[PDB]
Every structure is written in structure tokens, then in C-alpha cells.
Amino acid sequence: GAMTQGLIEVERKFAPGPDTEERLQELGATLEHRVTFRDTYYDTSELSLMLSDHWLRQREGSGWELKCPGVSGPHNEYVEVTSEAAIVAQLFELLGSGEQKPAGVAAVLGSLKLQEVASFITTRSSWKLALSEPQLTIDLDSADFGYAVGEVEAMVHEKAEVPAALEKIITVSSMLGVPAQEEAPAKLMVYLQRFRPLDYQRLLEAAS
Ligand SMILES: Cc1ncc(C[n+]2csc(CCOP(=O)(O)OP(=O)(O)O)c2C)c(N)n1
Ligand SMILES: [Mg+2]
Ligand SMILES: [Mg+2]
């Protein structure tokens, strides 16, 4: 037999500005693709998934994905699950349907009292940047509800490499975006804050 795993993705969000694309161009980045896609997130009425740092979505053209917290000191760690059967097992453990019998994620939604909590369309430009060695990716996202966020992404092999990669992408992010102390918010968090502010408040309360 054999075991297989992926690389580690390291990421940092930033607020783009009017000059972000021009900076990318002058740095020698190339625009690899432009794409538009719907994201739809799901949770229970009590926000069971989100309150425990679990994030379940169906992404147009990609299928189901679930993000779970992992056990970078100042920065978050996530395990991404895209196997439907592993998503469903994780959801059963957390939301406890002992009786529930497995199936595709879609089929188990009702049984788990999972409902759509947010849906929106993102228009994305994805750029690649080689410096002096593997190309960084820069995703520039525009959400149809009216919010723009960029993100710099690097891949690395071992967890030992994560701290240096983080510093690099933080520094690159700062040259591409508006000055800021903290990381720019995720599209979903801005959506929740503006359009589901009672839910946002629950999330705020939990984290402090
Ligand atoms: C302040 C804050 N930021 C981030 C998180 C974690 N989080 C919020 S929404 C989300 C899912 C959306 O992730 P995103 O990075 O926007 O996915 P993308 O659309 O870029 O693929 C996660 C993991 C949190 N709990 N609190
Ligand atoms: Mg990306
Ligand atoms: Mg990303």
C-alpha cells in the first residue's frame, strides 16, 4: 500500500487599493486566470459549526469543503477536508447523529438541521509572482455584495518552513495593499457582519 499527503498552504489577506494591479504588473506578476464562482455556507440555527471554528461550504465548480481547526503560534491552523465521506463523518461526530446513516453531504443536511447561512458570488483574478523562488499566488477577490479582499498564498513541504513563509507573505501583502495593523477580514465574516449581525455578535462574543 501507500500513503499520500499534500503540501501546506500559507496565506495572508490584505485590503487592495486602486494601485494593487499596477503594482503586481510592475513587479512582473502575470494574470493567470479570471473566474467567477458562487460560495454557499451552511450551519445550524445555533451556529454550532462556526462557534467551534468549523466552516462548511459548497463552492461552484469545486464541490463540498469543510475546514476544521487544527491543534504558527500567533496565526491560525486549519485542516481542509474535501472528501465527502470524511466531511460527513466529521459532521456526525460534531452534530451527533448516532442514528444517521452516511450518504453524500447534501443528503445529510436536513438530518443534521444544517441550513444555508450565506451565499455570494466572487469574481476573482489570480496572479502568479516569481521573486529573485517558487511563484507566490495572489488572489484578488471582488464579492458581489460589495467587498474586495486580496490574499497572498505560498506552498511549503514541512511545518518547519511555515514561520518564514508567513513573514515573507505578510511583507509582500503590505506592499500590495492599503496600510493596516491587522489582517483583512474574510468575505464571509464581512457578509455576516453586514447582513446577519445577530449571528456576527454571537461569534464576536465567543472569541474574546
Ligand atoms: C476574525 C476571523 N477570521 C477568520 C476566521 C476563520 N474563518 C472565517 S470565515 C472562514 C471560511 C472562509 O475562508 P476564506 O479564507 O475566506 O476562503 P476563500 O474564499 O478565500 O477561499 C474561516 C476559516 C475566524 N473565526 N475569525
Ligand atoms: Mg488560491
Ligand atoms: Mg486562498
Numbering used by the authors: -1 to 69, 73 to 133, 139 to 214
The paper states:
The Vtc4p β-tunnel domain is not unique to eukaryotic polyP polymerases but is a structural hallmark of triphosphate tunnel metalloenzymes (TTMs), whose characteristic features are the presence of a topologically closed hydrophilic β-barrel, the preference for triphosphate-containing substrates, and for a divalent metal co-factor (PFAM families CYTH and VTC). Members of the ancient triphosphate tunnel metalloenzyme family can be found in all kingdoms of life. Our comparative analysis defines that most of these enzymes share a common catalytic mechanism in their tunnel centers, yet they have evolved different substrate recognition modes on their tunnel entries. The observed substrate plasticity apparently allows TTM proteins to act on a wide array of enzyme substrates and to perform very different reactions, many of which likely remain to be discovered.
We thus structurally characterized a mammalian TTM ThTPase, which was previously shown to specifically hydrolyze thiamine triphosphate (ThTP) into ThDP and Pi. We next solved a crystal structure of mouse ThTPase in the presence of ThTP and Mg2+ in a second crystal form grown at pH 9.0, where substrate hydrolysis can occur. Indeed, we found a product complex trapped in the active site of the enzyme, with a ThDP molecule and an orthophosphate located in the tunnel center. ThDP is coordinated by Arg-55 and Arg-57 in the substrate binding site but no longer allows for the coordination of a Mg2+/Mn2+ ion in metal binding site 1, possibly because the missing γ-phosphate would be required for Mg2+/Mn2+ coordination. The γ-phosphate in our structure apparently has been hydrolyzed, and the resulting Pi has slightly moved away from the tunnel center. It is now found coordinated by Arg-125 and in direct contact with a Mn2+ ion located in metal binding site 2, reinforcing the notion that this metal ion may play a crucial role in catalysis. The acidic patch in mouse ThTPase (corresponding to site 2 in AtTTM3 and ygiF) again allows for Mg2+ ion binding, as concluded from NMR titration experiments. The unique modes of substrate binding in ThTPases and adenylate cyclases allow these enzymes to carry out rather different reactions and to produce different leaving groups (ortho- and pyrophosphate, respectively) while maintaining a unified cleavage site in close proximity of metal binding site 2.
